[PDB]
Amino acid sequence: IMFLSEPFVRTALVKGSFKTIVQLPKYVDLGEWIALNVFEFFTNLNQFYGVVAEYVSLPASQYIDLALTWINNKVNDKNLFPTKNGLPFPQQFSRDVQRIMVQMFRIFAHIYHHHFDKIVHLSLEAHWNSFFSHFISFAKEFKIIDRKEMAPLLPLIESFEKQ
Amino acid sequence: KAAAVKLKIENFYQSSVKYAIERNERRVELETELTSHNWSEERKSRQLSSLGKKESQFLRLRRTRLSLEDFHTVKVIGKGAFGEVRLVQKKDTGKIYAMKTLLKSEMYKKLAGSDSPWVVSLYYSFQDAQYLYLIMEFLPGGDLMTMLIRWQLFTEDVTRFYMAECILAIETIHKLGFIHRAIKPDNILIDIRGHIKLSDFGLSTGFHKTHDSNYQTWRKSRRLMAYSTVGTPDYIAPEIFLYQGYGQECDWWSLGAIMYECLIGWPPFCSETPQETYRKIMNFEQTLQFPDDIHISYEAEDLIRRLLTHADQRLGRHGGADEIKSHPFFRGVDWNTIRQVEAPYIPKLSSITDTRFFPTDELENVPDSPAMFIGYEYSRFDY
Ligand SMILES: Nc1ncnc2c1ncn2[C@@H]1O[C@H](COP(=O)(O)OP(=O)(O)NP(=O)(O)O)[C@@H](O)[C@H]1O
């Protein structure tokens, strides 16, 4: 009668293939290929927290609309986004997504902590892993995410092959 | 070591497994398209050429983003039951762009790409909630019924130009394993150079079934309310109604209906009502009449007579797309050179926003409105 708790994400066994996707293609402008992979990782992560919607090591949380739609509004700000013809990008965007690739993580492993519990129960369980493995093995490729930042999800990071 | 299983009790994600079965494809799609990157390693060592630094540069492309109101509408052009067409430019760049508004749900019937010289080339597609929106190449020269209104052509070598070039127009349609099966003066557009590009039926619907049971300024009784419901059996080879049948012969026949209206100026069957065709159009034979404005060539007449013969198979060929070119009615042309030749009429337009060949006016009916972001992912590249 009326009591709750927290975390516990473990362990492994998931999904498919390997690597090689996140590598910058031959002779392609980086500024593009960054915006590409991050404009993917957003919608996909939001599509995953779009599965866990509501139902409420972490904040009091349940904010995350405040956190994600910051990025939903910030991916729809045109001025950071090389849409037109050959019209190019600031490269001060380094501060932007050295922040922004890693905002995504803070929801990611937040789901992993407490709410990866329900993830399994869906039997979507194995998708979350390789998708996160792909998000990571992108970030661990470009150092787009800083090292100290990764602490809470480090156990799943220890895995067999990711990057 | 680990254990248990099997919950799946919640309303929650009723459908949200959509993530699982979708992303796999998006991942399949991710993979191949990044080995679509390997259109590189094409590797010419062939030339002795430069040097001259790096001759490779690629953005490459983008999968971008979109909207309406990213579109500054220039003017209205045309309308339909599914939707409405326009002339617009892209607010951002500016450009010559035709604009097709249409109905998604609610619209029913819920394969092939493109190109050809003879057909309006569709650029691309995007949709908001209710409506579909398109871009095609803008053709400044109006449509053909629009040209028939202002002067009901006295033809000969004018129309000798407009058929032929239309025979080839259909030629690529059938050649491509299609029947346009909409042969309409307003399904045909005139480009800048005065030649012809027809878009396509597209394919936007409607049919005549089964039948209904009730029980020079005098010739300008044309332009009767335009249509704004339509379509009439202007063409409508009566192999369609009644039953299934046809193939190419529907199209050629249907061009007999346009030969008539070009020369003597009306659908042969001109019904003055919708349903006096089927009727007349069903029947013909007896109901196809040739007036006493007695000027026509033998060859121009005889043609509409082998056009308005049946879809007939059996003894004969029809059998067309050629034997059709064989006709004595056509002296020339080389069947190539037609593409570049003086068009008997090339539109004079003072500027490129000139709507001068389209009848603006107004109606404002699309029995839809209550009333009150898209995506790009492809393979190839243009132009
Ligand atoms: N790029 C263009 N160039 C010239 N005219 C165009 C162009 N795009 C649209 N139009 C005009 O739009 C009119 C009709 O559009 P359309 O797609 O044919 O409507 P519809 O009812 O779907 N098809 P249809 O029944 O054959 O008219 C045409 O007859 C043209 O006048």
Numbering used by the authors:
A (entry chain B): 93 to 148, 175 to 281
B (entry chain A): 282 to 391, 404 to 508, 558 to 714, 739 to 749
Paper's wording?
In the RAM network, the hippo-like kinase Kic1 activates the NDR-related kinase Cbk1, which forms a complex with the coactivator protein Mob2. Here we describe the crystal structure of the yeast Cbk1–Mob2 complex, providing what is to our knowledge the first structural template for an NDR/LATS kinase–Mob coactivator complex. In each structure, Mob2 binds to the conserved N-terminal extension of the Cbk1 AGC kinase domain, a region previously identified as the site by which NDR kinases bind Mob proteins. In all three structures, the Cbk1 HM peptide is wedged into a binding slot in the deep cleft formed by the kinase’s αMob helix, N-linker region, and N-terminal catalytic domain lobe.
In addition to Cbk1 intact in its HM region, we used a variant in which threonine 743 was replaced by glutamic acid, an activating substitution that is at least partially phosphomimetic. Another crystal form of the Cbk1(HM-E)–Mob2 complex diffracted to 4.5 Å, with one complex in the asymmetric unit. The domain arrangements for the kinase and its coactivator are the same in all final crystallographic models. While replacement of the phosphorylated threonine with glutamic acid at this site increases Cbk1’s activity in vitro and in vivo, it is uncertain how closely this mutation mimics the biochemical effect of phosphorylation. In our crystal structures, unphosphorylated wild-type (WT) HM region (HM-T) and HM region with glutamic acid substitution (HM-E) associate with the Mob2-supported binding site in a similar manner. Similar MD analysis of the Cbk1(HM-E)–Mob2 structure indicates that HM-E also has more restrained movement of the HM region within the binding slot than HM-T, but slot compression was significantly less pronounced compared to HM-P. This suggests that HM-E is only a partial substitute for HM-P.
